Each structure stands twice: as structure tokens, then as C-alpha cells.
Amino acid sequence: GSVQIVYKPVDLSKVTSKCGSLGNIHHKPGGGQVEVKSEKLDFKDRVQSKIGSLDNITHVPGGGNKKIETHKLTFRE
Amino acid sequence: GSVQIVYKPVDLSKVTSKCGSLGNIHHKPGGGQVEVKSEKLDFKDRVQSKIGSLDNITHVPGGGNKKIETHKLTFRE
Amino acid sequence: GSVQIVYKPVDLSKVTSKCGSLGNIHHKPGGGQVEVKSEKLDFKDRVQSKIGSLDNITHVPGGGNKKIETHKLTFRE
Amino acid sequence: GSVQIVYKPVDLSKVTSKCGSLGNIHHKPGGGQVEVKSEKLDFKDRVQSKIGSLDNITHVPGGGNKKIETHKLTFRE
Amino acid sequence: GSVQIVYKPVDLSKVTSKCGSLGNIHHKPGGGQVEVKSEKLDFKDRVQSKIGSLDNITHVPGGGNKKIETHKLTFRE
DSSP, rough: EEEEEOOOOOOOOOOEEEEEEEBBOOOOOOOOEEEEEBBBOOSSSBBBBSSSSSOOOOOOOOSSSEEEEEEEEEEEO | OEEEEEEOOOOOOOOOOEOOOOOOBOOOOOOOOOEEEBBOOOOOOBOOOSSSSOEEEEEOOOSOOOOOOEEOOOEEO | HHHHHHEEEEEOOEEEEEHHHHHOOOOOOOOOOOOOOOOOOOOOOSBBOOOSOOEEEEOSSSSOOOEEEEEOEEEOO | OOOOEEOOOOOOOOOOOOOSSSSOOOOOOOOEEEEEOSOOOOSSSBBBOBBSSOOOEOOOOOOOOEEEEEEEEEEEO | OOOOEOOOOOOOOOOOOOEEBBOOOOOOOOOEEEEEOSSSSSOOOSOOOOOOOOOOEOOOOOSSSOEEEEOEEEEEE
């Protein structure tokens, strides 16, 4: 027997930002010690480690509009 | 026998931000010590670890409008 | 026998923010010690650990409008 | 025998924020010690742990309007 | 025999906030000690633990209007 699939998505979205002014973003951490003690580091199959860190991230987009879209069609028989 | 699928989504959304001014974002942590003691670090199949950290994230979008959309069609027989 | 599916969603939503001014966001933690004692760290199949941390996150969107939408059609026989 | 499905949702929603001014958001914790004692950390199938933490999150959207929508159609025979 | 389903929801909702001014949000905890003593940490199938914590969350939306909607159609035979 026949089958029919019409996969027809229509998109007219708007992801809009309007910022008149952005200013005076201060970022002054004091910073502290990190002391890590260990003996061995046996790692395996999938490891995303991080041992000992002082990260400082300043992220000022002036418009950081994201849009994630995901389409999928699966056919079996 | 026949089958028919008409997958027809229509989208006219608006994700809108309007910020006249953004300012004076201060970020001043004092910072403290971190002391970690261990003997061994045996890791395996999927590990997302983090041992010892002072992270400082300043995130000022000026419009941080997200929009996550996900479509899926599954056909079996 | 025949089957018919008309999957027709219509969307005209609005996710709207209007902020005249955003200011004076102060963020000044004092910061304290962290002392962790252990002997071994045997991890396995899915682990999302975090041992010892002073995180400081400042998040000022100026409009942080999210919109999560999820469509799904499943067909079996 | 025939079947028919007309899945027709109509959406004209509005998720609206209007904030004239946002200001003077102060965030000054004093910070305290954390002392954790253990011997072993055997983890398994799905673990989302966190051992020892001083998190400080400042979240000022200026409009934080969320909208979660979820559609699903399931067909079996 | 035939079947027919017309799934036709209509939505014209409004989730509206109007805040003239938001200000002077002070957040100053004093902070205290945490002492945790243990011997072993055997975890298993689904664990969402948290051992030892001083979390400080400041959340000022300026409009935090949520709207959760969930549609479902199930067909069996």
C-alpha cells in the first residue's frame, strides 16, 4: 500500500532585542587560593575533568539572542 | 492500505526585548580558600567532574532572548 | 484501510519585555573557606560531580525572554 | 476502516512584561566555612552530586518571561 | 468502521505584568559554618545529591511571567 508524508513547517518568527545603552559593567573579584592534594589520576572512557581553577568570564553581548531549532523525520518499515 | 500525514506547523511568534538602558552592574566577590584532599581519582564511562574552583561569570546580554523549538516525526510499520 | 493525519498547529504568540532602565546591580559576597577531605573517588557510568566550589554568577539580561516549544508525531502499526 | 485526525491548535497568546525601572539590587552575603569529611566516593549509573559549595547567583532579567509549550500525537495499531 | 477526531484548541490568553518601579532589593545573609561527617558515599541508579552548601540566589525578574502548556493526543487500537 501507498504512504504519503507532507512535512511542511512554516516559520516567520522574530527574536528581537533593542537596547538603547549598556555601560558600567564592573567585574572585580578578589581572588583566592586553591589547594588540591591527590595521589593518582586514572581516567577513562569519556572524562571532562577540571582540577584547580580561577575562571573569570565577562560576557556582554549587546544582543545575545539565540534560536535553536531541530527538525527530524524518521522512516522505518 | 494507504496512509497520509500532513505535518503543517505555522509559526509567527515574536520573542521581543526592549531595554532603554542597562548600567552599574558591579561584581566584586571577596574570594576564599579551597582545600581539597584526596588519595586516588579513578574515573570511568561518562564523567563531568570539577574539583576545586572559583568561577566568576558576568553575563550581561542587553537582550538575551532564547527560543528553542524541536520538531519530530516518527514512522514505523 | 486508509488513515489520515493533518497535524496543523498555528502559532502567533508574543513573548515581550519592555524595561525602561536597569541599574545599580551590586554583587559583593564575602567569600569563605571550603575544606573537603576524602580518600578515593571511584566514579562510573554517568557522573556530573563538583567537589569544592565558590561560584559567582551575575546574569543581567535586559530581557531574558525564553520560549521552549516541542512538537512530536509518532506512528506505529 | 478509515481513521481521520485533524490536530489543529491555534495560539494567539501574549506573555508581556512592562517594567518602568529596576535598580539598587544589592547582594552581599557574609560567607561561611564548609567542612566535609568522608572516606570513599563510589558513584554509579546516574549521579548529579555536589560536595562543598558557596554559590552566589544574581539573576536580574529586566523581563524574564518564559513560555513552555509541548505538543504530542501518538498513533498505534 | 470510521473514526474521526478534530482536536481544535483555540488560545487567546494574556499573561501580563506592569511594574512601575522595582528597587532597594537588599540581600545580606550572615553566613554560618557547615560540618558534615561521613565514612562512605555509595550512590546508585538516579541520585541528585548535595552535601554541604551555602547557596545565595537573588532573582529579580522585572516581570517573571511563566506559561506552561501541554497538549497530548493518544491513539491505540
